[PDB]
Amino acid sequence: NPPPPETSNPNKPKRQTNQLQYLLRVVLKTLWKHQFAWPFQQPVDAVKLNLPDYYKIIKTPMDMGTIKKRLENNYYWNAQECIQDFNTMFTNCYIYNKPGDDIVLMAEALEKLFLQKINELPT
Ligand SMILES: COc1cc(-c2cn(C)c(=O)c3cnccc23)c(OC)cc1CN(C)C
């Protein structure tokens, strides 16, 4: 498995815009709570899950635990950087798994909530 994604941005200002505050305290908070969040809260272990070619098809692994850490410890420069990671997480799932998979049905319910909160992004 690839090393876990970087979650610290050491030489960077400790300033969170209100949109990034929204991404943590509304978007992430609500998604993290969701019933189907648990398959997405940690990096995919392609070995233990026996996912052939997962890291061949998936060039940018991403997960909600990484996003949570990055939001919590000031990694993102701006909101769109964070929104892109959420999208990457959902994209990875949709391009690797099949439309009938439980994991895809769960991702779609999770993404519905994501999109709803993003539709209400302030400013
Ligand atoms: C963390 O453990 C799990 C991960 C996943 C999981 C997540 N993502 C994002 C995937 O793409 C994915 C792709 N294929 C197979 C599995 C997963 C999971 O699928 C419902 C179940 C568990 C529970 N386990 C005790 C088997």
Swiss-Prot record:
Entry superkingdom: Eukaryota
Role according to the record: Chromatin reader protein that recognizes and binds acetylated histones and plays a key role in transmission of epigenetic memory across cell divisions and transcription regulation. Remains associated with acetylated chromatin throughout the entire cell cycle and provides epigenetic memory for postmitotic G1 gene transcription by preserving acetylated chromatin status and maintaining high-order chromatin structure. During interphase, plays a key role in regulating the transcription of signal-inducible genes by associating with the P-TEFb complex and recruiting it to promoters.
Tissue: Ubiquitously expressed.
Bridged cysteine pairs (disulfide): none
Associated disease: Cornelia de Lange syndrome 6: A form of Cornelia de Lange syndrome, a clinically heterogeneous developmental disorder associated with malformations affecting multiple systems. It is characterized by facial dysmorphisms, abnormal hands and feet, growth delay, cognitive retardation, hirsutism, gastroesophageal dysfunction and cardiac, ophthalmologic and genitourinary anomalies. CDLS6 inheritance is autosomal dominant.
Site feature Acetylated histone binding, where: N97
Additional note from the record: JQ1, a thieno-triazolo-1,4-diazepine derivative, and I-BET, a benzodiazepine derivative, have been tested on tumors with success. Treatment with GSK1210151A (I-BET151, a I-BET derivative) has strong effets on mixed lineage leukemia and promotes myeloid differentiation and leukemia stem-cell depletion.
Shown segment, full-protein numbering: 44 to 166 of 1362
Post-translation changes: Phosphorylation by CK2 disrupt the intramolecular binding between the bromo domain 2 and the NPS region and promotes binding between the NPS and the BID regions, leading to activate the protein and promote binding to acetylated histones. In absence of phosphorylation, BRD4 does not localize to p53/TP53 target gene promoters, phosphorylation promoting recruitment to p53/TP53 target promoters.
Assembly information from the UniProt record: Interacts with p53/TP53; the interaction is direct. Interacts (via CTD region) with CDK9 and CCNT1, acting as an associated component of P-TEFb complex. Interacts with RELA (when acetylated at 'Lys-310'). Interacts (via NET domain) with NSD3, CHD4, BICRA and ATAD5. The interaction with BICRA bridges BRD4 to the GBAF complex. Interacts (via NET domain) with JMJD6 (via JmjC and N-terminal domains); the interaction is stronger in presence of ssRNA and recruits JMJD6 on distal enhancers. Interacts with NSD3. Interacts with NIPBL.
Highest classification ranks of the organism: Eukaryota, Metazoa, Chordata, Craniata, Vertebrata
Domain Bromo span(s) in chain numbering: 15-121
Protein name, as recorded: Bromodomain-containing protein 4
Organism (species): Homo sapiens (Human)
